[model samples]
Target: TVLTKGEIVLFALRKFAIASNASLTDVEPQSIEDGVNDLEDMMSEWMINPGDIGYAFATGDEQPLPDDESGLPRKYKHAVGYQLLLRMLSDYSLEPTPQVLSNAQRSYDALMTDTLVVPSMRLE
Candidate 1:
């Protein structure tokens, strides 16, 4: 069964707070609840009518690059990215197996190398 948007948002917020070592009481519960409601509304609208390339990529209709060979959808890309991040974070906290750490580190390095670097030039 599909989870409700509010459920997903609340779960995410609670998970985030716990992961960061903060008590739910330490967070502004009302504010977080309000934000979750807002997120639920946004997600509900998206479910009704989709927009943006990311959404398309997520549903597996299009790729971020046509001729780039992988042909993987943006959703998969994001899923992989998140998985790597979660794995790395888990390793830091849980002492993940060496293989998992190695895989996560390799993917992280590759992603970093392939990303475009933009330097910030400050104006005094």
Candidate 2:
């Protein structure tokens, strides 16, 4: 399934944001905002010359592709979808309000940490 350009940009941006947020200490929230804005710009541009929506929809779930030789299960696909919607909802023209950005950052951090990957690894 071929993704429309906008969909591709959205997918890439979402993945980038989620990965960057996971390593939050290294990334400033403003940077993530900027990246998301860039993606929004790309999406807007595509809307101007709108492409195949069916194609975009078809490719939407393409990220969770079969894992290769690596044993790690691929689960970040859902994260990509969620972040895409989050970026779509945000107003890119303004800087993310401090409280909002901080809260989102902290919330994402907590969710990432709290999600149990291995029951046996549970401490406490």
Query: How well does each candidate superpose onto the true structure, as a TM-score?
Result: 0.27, 0.24
Off by over 4 Å in 2: 1-86, 89-91, 115-124
**In candidate 2, what residue range of length 10 has the lowest lDDT sum?**
64-73
Per residue, candidate 1 scores C-alpha lDDT tens digits across 39-76 of 43443354565422122221346322222222224323
Candidate 1 lDDT (Cα, whole model)? 0.39
Estimate the overall C-alpha local distance difference test score of candidate 2: 0.39
lDDT of each: 0.39, 0.39
**How much RMSD separates candidate 1 from the native structure?**
14.2
Q: Write the per-residue lDDT of candidate 2 for residues 24-116, one digit (tens) a residue.
A: 533423334344445445434544654322212213444322111111112432333343435543533323445545655664454345665
